[PDB]
Design a protein around this nucleic acid. Structure first.
Ligand SMILES: [Mg+2]
Ligand SMILES: [Mg+2]
Ligand SMILES: [Mg+2]
Ligand SMILES: [Mg+2]
Ligand SMILES: [Mg+2]
Ligand SMILES: [Mg+2]
Ligand SMILES: [Mg+2]
Ligand SMILES: [Mg+2]
Ligand SMILES: [Mg+2]
Ligand SMILES: [Mg+2]
Ligand SMILES: [Mg+2]
Ligand SMILES: [Mg+2]
Ligand SMILES: [Mg+2]
Ligand SMILES: [Mg+2]
Ligand SMILES: [Mg+2]
Ligand SMILES: [Mg+2]
Ligand SMILES: [Mg+2]
Ligand SMILES: [Mg+2]
Ligand SMILES: [Mg+2]
Ligand SMILES: [Zn+2]
Lengths: 98, 155, 125, 206, 60, 24, 80, 127
RNA sequence: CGCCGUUAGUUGCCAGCGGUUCGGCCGGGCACUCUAACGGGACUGCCCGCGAAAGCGGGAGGAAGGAGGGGACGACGUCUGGUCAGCAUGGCCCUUACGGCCUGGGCGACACACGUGCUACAAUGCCCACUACAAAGCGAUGCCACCCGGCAACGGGGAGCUAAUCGCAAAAAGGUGGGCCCAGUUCGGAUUGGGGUCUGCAACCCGACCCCAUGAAGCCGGAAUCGCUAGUAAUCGCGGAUCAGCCAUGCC
């Protein structure tokens, strides 16, 4: 039962996890529940376009946070060895609570 | 409407009589978009007409609306000095719009407390040929053909 | 009948009629009816003498209503003024007290308007 | 008023951000404020090397910091004296062990940040605006670039009345996201006052 | 703002109540976001230079 | 109306609770 | 309809300065800047000169003005 | 044995299940006239059934989620129309002309700035 | 945003089933909904009429038709438009202060006047009760469930959450039943008296909130004038940024 959470500001960078971790044993060792998407908390920052007056201008900025679950039962010895320290993404964070 | 000729938007038929004219009347009664409360009023009126008249309710509505439709009306227009009320026919589209509107307006002038009672007695008074709704129609018609001395300004 | 000081509300619900008494409002009303078991809906003209007496003997010997209440309030504000109090000076001027903006909307506490010279050579908006 | 930053307008596509790194709601403001302290310092020191964009990444308490310059030579230093003390002051701000890198710019005439920084140095140095600009657009246009444009603000020539000098070539479809248009701005502190200089270079399409 | 006033992180401000945000990039004490430590002007400026990670221009 | 503190809709609007609008 | 909870507040500037005069006698003028302090019983008689932003106005404290704040007796703005 | 259809409208989704039965409609557990109790519109949802003289020829278990009873009323009317075409593909020659198959796409228009309600612009004076 | 498919099922469900404290609560499948990555789909493409062509009217298939709907985007330039109090920046002026520091006061003054709004004048309404439906967002030195005390604001207790897995939440207009009966009223809730909670070193000037009492003007508004063409107007309520708290009836 391997539970690893995946946060991130970019949704293509997170994918650099699913197509990399599920390559151990999807139909041989464990089952691999696969990467679940989960909702994505959005942050909006609305700002007045210019300095001084002009209240009716404004521009919108959002900071979308994407999520991933994964979760894989059967913490195989050899399967974990590989999917241990062979990553690449820089705009991703991981949490583990298997 | 400077570009398009504007197309009338047909509305969903009645959920009882199936008549589309009926829905229209309900929309006029509706305020703040409370369609339910609206319909709940119109139908409540059809009940009040069934006991007052042995005749079916839809027969009354049809009659009422028809009596309240103006054949002619005046429409202001500058011609070279002041404003001139020029008489002229009223298109079928408009006759309907006005009848229904006036009906609902005179309706809420009656003293009766219950809304449904106001529409009911008002529809009945309309088919009978009486009632303030039919007055407006009469006064508008009396308005034109009272200015025939300008009817040559078609417009 | 007279429940509170010279009070004669009739032809109406007891809990509503009671409101016409001075220091009595919706709360005290439906409260005095429960603590005296009097059906709130009943019309005053339909109250038992026995019930009226209970209401009378209660409402008067339980709260401070009418004139005597006006007296205390009239007295309280007078106190605020006698002492150099701030709220006091406000009561003297006839201006709001609960810290409200007086550049506009102080009508209720200032009565009808006292329109005077508001402009002469500048945007009269 | 009109016209939004052409990069901020493309950040999404055809213009990856300038610092890719997640950060929770509680730390972000810090990791961000730090980026500035850094980006700022480097920007002032490595001036002469002429920098384009200081990209920054973050990991398990780590810091990328890849300065894109045209004269890496002057960046590194003799045998490694410049590239040395820098990581000495950087790691002081960031106790996360800040690696540091230096990249070569394949021609500094397609680096709006530079082309603008260029014309700016000329103006601060009493040059003739219209000319500097005509040349700049040329050089840029000289080495590829499907289009280019340079804009100098006002007080052109020390004059009392501020103005704006145009000059552009080829295409510059600002209204197209699928454009990849580099943008560069440069001040020009002079004896009479400031003078903005914006630089636009249009390269590649889809 | 003036330099003398810049000092939100002055620490021990006597009472937590006297402490106030203030922009970390311009000193602006009038519309500083908590998530950014910046004011609405700077938030707009840097976001345009993609210097605020992940911060994009919204649109729906 | 939304202006009556000691009323249902009065509390809703003012976004509060009390005798005129318990929590549950 | 005032409110301060359960813990009547008063600034010890005078709170501890008044309790002293109660160990000797009266006192003429006690200029303060603490109009935050809720006048306590142990003040009646003393003449505290409250500040208005411009001057110190003497306010004779009386049994009548117990829980009232010193500022309430020292008007700030000047109207006609 | 049982036929299904989705159906959506203005933020409302309702799953529709039809089974050759009597006619009862188990909407979210309650009877139809129980969930859409006292809303002169409900009769609408069941309309498509009347398009093919069915109704008592089927039975329908429906679950709704999202929006308002009136939005749901239409979503439901779309399921009762699709699940019906799954039962019989030839049930489009009639069920379609009336439009019952089109998915009402009108949605709450976004709220723009400098405006009170999206389009509703603030009012002014001197101008 | 609108339809369909693929990929992934700690959202989902009697779909067909077996366990029921009959709560999808355990088993358990992920089908459907949803989540979100990606992908398909319309192109006047087809039929008919008109046309030199572009294209215009009309029709079928289709979730969608001919710019399907809403955004982001705003040319050369004009207004010597706005801002040097965001920030830079040339010039000018200040030094023992046109710097700095505090405590307090002021920006909250009011005889008046205007803009923008809120709440109303009520019965297609108001009150009470019971009861059904959202979306998007938020949760630390916080969001706060079911508990206890208080009419209550709230106080003490204390579970879960670290948040599609807990909480804010009750959505409100709605529906059902009952009350009011046309009255300045069970319309309206201004103002003022009293008692109290909370945040804060501290609420007099200058906070919000609760409860009792008070219960104003207002019976739909002169000249004139504003918004809006469809899920629009109108109407109903919910969230958030700022933020200890809050004068937000503002803004998004
Ligand atoms: Mg505009
Ligand atoms: Mg715009
Ligand atoms: Mg000189
Ligand atoms: Mg400064
Ligand atoms: Mg503060
Ligand atoms: Mg009321
Ligand atoms: Mg001392
Ligand atoms: Mg709306
Ligand atoms: Mg699908
Ligand atoms: Mg079973
Ligand atoms: Mg053709
Ligand atoms: Mg365009
Ligand atoms: Mg001000
Ligand atoms: Mg209790
Ligand atoms: Mg009722
Ligand atoms: Mg009106
Ligand atoms: Mg309104
Ligand atoms: Mg707040
Ligand atoms: Mg609100
Ligand atoms: Zn700033």
């Amino acid at each position: 039962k391997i539970r690893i959470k995946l946060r991130g500001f970019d949704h293509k960078t997170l994918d650099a996890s699913a197509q990399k971790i599920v390559e151990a044993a999807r139909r041989s060792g464990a089952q691999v529940s696969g990467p679940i998407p989960l909702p994505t908390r959005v942050r909006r920052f609305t700002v007045i376009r210019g300095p001084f007056k002009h209240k009716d201008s404004r521009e919108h900025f959002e900071l979308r946070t994407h999520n991933r679950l994964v979760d894989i039962i059967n913490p195989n010895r050899k399967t974990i060895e590989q999917l241990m320290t062979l990553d690449l993404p820089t705009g991703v964070e991981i949490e583990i609570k298997t | 409407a400077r570009r398009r000729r504007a197309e009338v938007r047909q509305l969903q038929p009645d959920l009882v009589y199936g008549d589309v004219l009926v829905t229209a009347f309900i929309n006029k009664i509706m305020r703040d978009g409370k369609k339910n409360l609206a319909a709940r009023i119109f139908y409540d009126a059809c009940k009040i007409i069934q006991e007052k008249t042995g005749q079916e309710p839809l027969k009354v509505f049809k009659q009422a609306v028809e009596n309240v439709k103006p054949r002619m009306e005046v429409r202001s227009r500058r011609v070279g000095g002041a404003n001139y009320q020029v008489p002229m026919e009223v298109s079928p589209r408009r006759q309907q719009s006005l009848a229904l509107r006036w009906l609902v307006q005179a309706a809420n002038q009656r003293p009766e407390r219950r809304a449904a009672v106001r529409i009911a007695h008002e529809l009945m008074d309309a088919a009978e040929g009486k009632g303030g709704a039919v007055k407006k129609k009469e006064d508008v018609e009396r308005m034109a053909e009272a200015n025939r001395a300008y009817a040559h300004y078609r417009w | 009948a007279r429940i509170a000081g010279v009070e004669i509300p009739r032809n109406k619900r007891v809990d509503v009629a009671l409101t016409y008494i001075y220091g009595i409002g919706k709360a005290r009303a439906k409260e005095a009816l429960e603590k005296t078991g009097i059906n709130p809906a009943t019309r005053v003209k339909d109250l038992t003498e026995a019930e009226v007496v209970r209401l009378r003997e209660y409402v008067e010997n339980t709260w401070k209503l009418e004139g005597e209440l006006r007296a205390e309030v009239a007295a309280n504000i007078k106190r605020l003024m006698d002492i150099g109090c701030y709220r006091g000076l406000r009561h003297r001027r006839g201006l709001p007290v609960r810290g409200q903006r007086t550049r506009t909307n102080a009508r209720t506490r200032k009565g009808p308007r006292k329109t005077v010279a508001g402009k002469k050579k500048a945007p009269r908006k | 008023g009109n016209k939004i930053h052409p990069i901020g307008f493309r950040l999404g596509i055809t213009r990856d951000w300038e610092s890719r790194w997640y950060a929770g709601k509680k730390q972000y403001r810090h990791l961000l404020l730090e980026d500035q302290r850094i980006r700022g310092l480097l920007e002032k020191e490595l001036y002469s090397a002429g920098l384009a964009r200081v990209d920054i990444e973050r990991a398990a308490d780590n810091v990328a910091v890849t300065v894109h310059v045209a004269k890496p030579g002057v960046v590194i230093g003799r045998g490694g004296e410049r590239i040395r003390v820098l990581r000495e002051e950087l790691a002081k701000l960031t106790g996360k062990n800040v690696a540091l890198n230096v990249q070569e710019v394949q021609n500094p005439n397609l680096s709006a940040p530079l082309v603008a920084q260029r014309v700016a140095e000329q103006i601060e140095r009493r040059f003739a605006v219209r000319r500097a600009i005509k040349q700049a657009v040329q050089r840029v246009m000289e080495s590829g670039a499907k289009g280019a444009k340079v804009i100098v603000s006002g007080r052109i020539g020390g004059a009392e009345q501020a103005r704006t000098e145009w000059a552009a070539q080829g295409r510059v479809p600002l209204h197209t996201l699928r454009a990849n248009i580099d943008y560069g701005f440069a001040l020009a502190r002079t004896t009479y006052g400031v003078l903005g200089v914006k630089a636009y270079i249009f390269l590649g399409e889809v | 703002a003036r330099k003398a006033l810049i000092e939100k992180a002055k620490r021990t401000p006597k009472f937590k109540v006297r402490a106030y945000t203030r922009c970390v990039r311009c000193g602006r004490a009038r519309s500083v976001y908590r998530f950014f430590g910046l004011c609405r002007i700077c938030l707009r400026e840097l976001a345009h230079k993609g210097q605020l990670p992940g911060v994009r221009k919204a649109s729906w | 109306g939304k202006g009556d503190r000691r009323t249902r809709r009065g509390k809703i609007w003012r976004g509060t609770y009390g005798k005129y609008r318990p929590r549950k | 309809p005032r409110s301060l909870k359960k813990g009547v507040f008063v600034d010890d500037h005078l709170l501890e300065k008044v309790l002293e005069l109660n160990a000797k006698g009266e006192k003429r003028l006690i200029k303060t800047w603490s109009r935050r302090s809720t006048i306590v019983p142990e003040m009646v008689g003393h003449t505290i000169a409250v500040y208005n932003g411009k001057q110190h106005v003497p306010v004779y404290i009386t049994e009548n003005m117990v829980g009232h704040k010193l500022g309430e007796f020292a008007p700030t703005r000047t109207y006609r | 044995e049982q036929y299904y259809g989705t159906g959506r409208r203005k933020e409302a989704v309702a799953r529709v299940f039809l089974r050759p039965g009597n006619g009862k409609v188990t909407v979210n557990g309650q009877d139809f006239n129980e969930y859409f109790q006292g809303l002169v519109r409900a009769v609408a949802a069941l309309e498509p059934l009347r398009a093919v003289d069915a109704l008592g020829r089927f039975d329908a278990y429906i679950t709704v989620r999202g929006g308002g009873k009136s939005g749901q009323i239409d979503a439901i009317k779309l399921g009762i129309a699709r699940a019906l075409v799954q039962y019989n593909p030839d049930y489009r020659a009639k069920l379609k002309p009336l439009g019952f198959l089109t998915r009402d796409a009108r949605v709450v228009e976004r709220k723009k700035y400098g405006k009170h309600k999206a389009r509703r612009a603030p009012q002014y004076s001197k101008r």
